[PDB]
Ligand binder design. Structure first.
Ligand code: F97
Ligand code: F97
Lengths: 282, 282
């Protein structure tokens, strides 16, 4: 709730443009005073967007004290532009990384999964839902540590609804806000992410999005699998099988998944990502 | 399913640009052969959109034989542009109209409601849902007749989802397709539309969309009312009250609403809209 009505250039020095997503650009910046490096996610706004509607989402991201959640430092509104300031992760997303390094090993994937689960267990304990688990939203810093990127803010500045809000029935409004989601949907997304990291794509990546969603509603839908059976351990395959449980009633929770063989095995540490980063330099 | 891979300029002559919505422009055109006038809704496409995913929606709009549903004549795909060709309504939408004429009388509103209900009863009998009932989507032709504008096509070419499809759990995919909607949500939208026609705005029009939806989820939410009590009959107020029933379980169906005093009263005919159109000329 500390949204500063200041120019973030008073506190930070912009260094370079990391890129830009569906909305907004991301900058690498340095704090004037501490010299520390931060990430600034910028989002352009109209005189139509109201900022106070975001205050609940920014509360969510601010009151998140976990090692596997990227750190929030404040927000800045200035001249119709919104800036979210966060702890900087030098290596970027797993997707930035595997697009150069090629597929991850089972050990690297296992460690990432464990770390992601740790952050999810936390989030779900605070009754929050990430909603967008995927390789592009898992950040790696230069110490090989793993951070879930920001959530719940990007999808509310979705000027797109199947309908028009002022004319929406209450039941429609409810679904348009919640998305029918539940916490265990993060667990499914994690399973797909593990395949993504293993195969450089999520399943059905070469197929139109709408068709993919259609197919998931058919009576006899079959959850995706690892393509190459021989390449991966029985434990990995089972991890995939149980995270991609079709019914959300039978799908294991984050803390339950943390007890899984694949992520509770010894020897999982950031060293695994460190030689992944070394591979980046080769 | 008769989507022509031709240039619609072979069959139709473009005359003038009626305007443009969130996506695409609308043209007034003339059929070369019959001389009849049509409306052409154009929508620009990428090499990312797949046309066959639309074939189910175009089937919906094609197999609709009702007097209160705007008539579909065919589709055209050519050079990454999609054209939907429909019966032309000369006066445009009720919104195009009331923005010049000012508020509608209770009699004009009643006749519009009846006609809209007739189209809805039909749609719901074919187990279809309009999803976007509002003044901008109720068309008036030069004979004062009433036509529901196209539906289910506009909201699927919503490249916006709270999440990423390939990583979505099945339960999430289901809600992202259906929208949790049910047919009776059209009835709510009709009620809001009746206020819109009466007051030139839907309720809470000057309030941020997200806030409006939030409010509809609160324990003690109160459905909107006609602002000026004295201006409208007891029948009109009751029509508002029952269409804006909060619980979709207690909300009346289209055919039930057709038995309502306000829309079953004698003397409701297109003559009412005809002097509305005369007012347009003054
Ligand atoms: C997701 C983003 C809003 N965000 N949030 C917190 C956060 C913390 N650190 C980074 N760090 C990085 C590092 C790198 C590495 C430099 C050399 N190439 C990769 N690239 C990127 N960008 C690649 C494409 C992008 F989405 F613009 C980001 N971000 C990004 C961060
Ligand atoms: C909703 C649209 C896709 N559609 N679908 C079927 C259809 C049949 N007839 C019209 N006719 C008209 C008439 C007029 C009147 C001329 C003089 N001004 C109003 N304006 C408009 N446009 C105003 C703003 C728009 F959305 F571009 C339309 N459309 C539009 C139609």
């Amino acid at each position: 709730p500390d949204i500063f009505n200041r120019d973030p250039r008073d506190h930070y020095d912009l260094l370079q443009r990391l890129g830009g997503g569906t909305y907004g650009e991301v900058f690498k910046a340095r704090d004037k005073v501490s010299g520390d490096l931060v990430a600034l996610k910028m989002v352009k706004m109209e005189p139509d967007d109201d900022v106070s509607t975001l205050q609940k989402e920014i509360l969510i991201l601010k009151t998140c004290r976990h090692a596997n959640i990227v750190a929030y430092h404040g927000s800045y509104l200035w001249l119709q532009k919104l800036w979210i300031c966060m702890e900087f992760c030098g290596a970027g997303s797993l997707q930035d990384i595997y697009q150069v390094t090629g597929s991850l090993s089972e050990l690297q994937i296992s460690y990432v999964c464990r770390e992601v689960l740790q952050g999810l267990a936390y989030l779900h304990s605070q009754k929050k839902i990430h909603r967008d688990i995927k390789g592009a939203n898992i950040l790696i810093n230069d110490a090989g540590e793993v951070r879930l990127a920001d959530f719940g803010i990007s999808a509310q500045i979705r000027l797109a609804f199947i309908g028009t809000p002022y004319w929406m029935a209450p039941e429609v409004a409810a679904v348009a806000l919640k998305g029918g989601y539940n916490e265990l949907c993060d667990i499914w997304s994690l399973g797909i992410t593990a395949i993504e990291l293993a195969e450089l794509q999520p399943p059905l990546f070469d197929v139109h999005p709408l068709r993919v969603l259609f197919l998931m509603t058919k009576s006899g839908y079959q959850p995706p699998r690892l393509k190459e059976k021989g390449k991966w351990s029985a434990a990995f395959h089972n991890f995939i099988k149980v995270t991609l449980t079709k019914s959300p009633k039978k799908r294991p929770s984050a803390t339950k998944m943390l007890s899984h063989q694949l992520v509770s095995q010894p020897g999982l540490n950031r060293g695994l990502i460190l030689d992944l980063l070394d591979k980046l330099k080769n």
